[PDB]
Amino acid sequence: GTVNWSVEDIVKGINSNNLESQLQATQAARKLLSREKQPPIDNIIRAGLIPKFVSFLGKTDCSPIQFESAWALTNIASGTSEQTKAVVDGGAIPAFISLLASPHAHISEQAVWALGNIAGDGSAFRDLVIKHGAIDPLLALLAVPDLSTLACGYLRNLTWTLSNLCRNKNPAPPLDAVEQILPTLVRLLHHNDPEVLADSCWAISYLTDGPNERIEMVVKKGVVPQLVKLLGATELPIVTPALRAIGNIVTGTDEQTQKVIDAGALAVFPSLLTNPKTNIQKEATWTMSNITAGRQDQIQQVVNHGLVPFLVGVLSKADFKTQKEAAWAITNYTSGGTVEQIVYLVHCGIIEPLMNLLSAKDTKIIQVILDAISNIFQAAEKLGETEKLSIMIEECGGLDKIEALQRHENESVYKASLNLIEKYF
Amino acid sequence: ARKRSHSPTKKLRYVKRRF
């Protein structure tokens, strides 16, 4: 019927002025563009079919051709950036926005999907979709008393498209658009569907990946407790974006970090810092490193939750990137901590793994470790116990590593190692 | 000690095809 048509036949059917022949040719095009392997998007574009599809988007009296052309254009916009640009150049954005209010739910859902692709191309097309006025009808589609009355696929598509509207930087989405979207996004963040939750968390993570004002916009909506709850979820697709959002939030001010701590986030990190998935471990260690860069009371809350031994463990054995994040966490801890917190750090057994990591090839981690060791030595000086720390470092084999680094190619490593050896060894 | 922001994503485009 409409299966395995040639682009020639599709073009002849769409060039006929018989709306039913046009409909069947458009369905054949949709079926070609929906094939698993190498859909012929470039050939369809070269045939000049995008303007015809966009015109078909406005055939209110023929809902089937609206649906077929919307699907075809969605799949074309899912290709390269040049093909999404081809779709946009045909005028598809306002037509899809007009279709958002279609009485046919499948047509509205397809329009949502297409706008999601277009906005997902990048920040320019994201802002252009916003300028054409998509947010208001999109949100109207979600203005229901209970989200559970909506079809699951429809709701997932709406959530994904909104997340794409929140995505990308340079520039970030317009502030007014973010404020207009956020309430619905929180409501979705409280939904029970795992995919909706994952996409909502990803959107919140996008919105929190920026200056402190952007983070404040999100945290004032009260999302942090729900984010922590989702941090404790069993589904990795939910935990990953929730952890990303929590990390972004703790990159902000001390009060936003304190909001994260007050919600009970630290109690989840014993599992996260031992999670079998390496990415979770790395992101959790980065989050901990940003939390140890906070106030001394926040470092003390890290201590009270028994998380210093977990940092020692990650420093002892983990993928090298997680170990680098842990070294950063240790250096921030030692930079901002009290003498008592630093001696507690040493009592947990940090010196030996911190020294074993001086074997690495990365220069920046070496500099970070040497800075942490200098801070720990300053604490030991204030206690008059420099010789005990030096004996510890010498027994570990760390003095060998430091004296070797005296001959390192980088200037800072050279000078830091020589300072340590001149002042304490 | 300064807060260290997350590294930029290398996934610049997020688009989906309907099969």
Residue numbers in the entry:
A (entry chain A): 72 to 496
B (entry chain B): 21 to 39
What text appears in the publication on this structure?
The MERS-CoV ORF4b protein has been shown to bind preferentially to the nuclear import adapter IMPα3 in infected cells, thereby inhibiting NF-κB-dependent innate immune responses. Our results provide a detailed structural basis that explains how a virus can target the IMPα nuclear import adapter to impair immunity, and illustrate how small mutations in ORF4b, like those found in closely related coronaviruses such as HKU5, change the IMPα binding mechanism.
Because the results indicated that MERS-CoV ORF4b NLS was able to bind IMPα isoforms with high affinity and showed little preference for a specific isoform, we examined the molecular interface with two IMPα isoforms using high-resolution structural approaches. Specifically, we crystallized the MERS-CoV ORF4b NLS bound to both IMPα2 and IMPα3 and resolved the structures to 2.1 Å and 2.5 Å resolution respectively. E Crystal structure of MERS-CoV ORF4b NLS bound to IMPα2 at 2.1 Å resolution. In the MERS-CoV ORF4b:IMPα2 structure, we were able to resolve slightly more of the MERS-CoV ORF4b including the region Lys30 Lys31, Leu32 between the major and minor sites. There were also two additional ORF4b residues contributing to IMPα2 binding when compared to the IMPα3 structure (Lys31 and Tyr34), however, these did not appear to contribute significantly to the binding affinity. Surprisingly, MERS ORF4b does not contain a Lys at the P2 site, but rather a Val (position 35), which did not form any interactions with the Gly150, Thr155, and Asp192 pocket. Rather, MERS ORF4b bound IMPα2 and IMPα3 through an Arg residue (position 33, the equivalent of the P0 position) at this site and formed similar interactions to those made by a Lys NZ nitrogen at the P2 site.
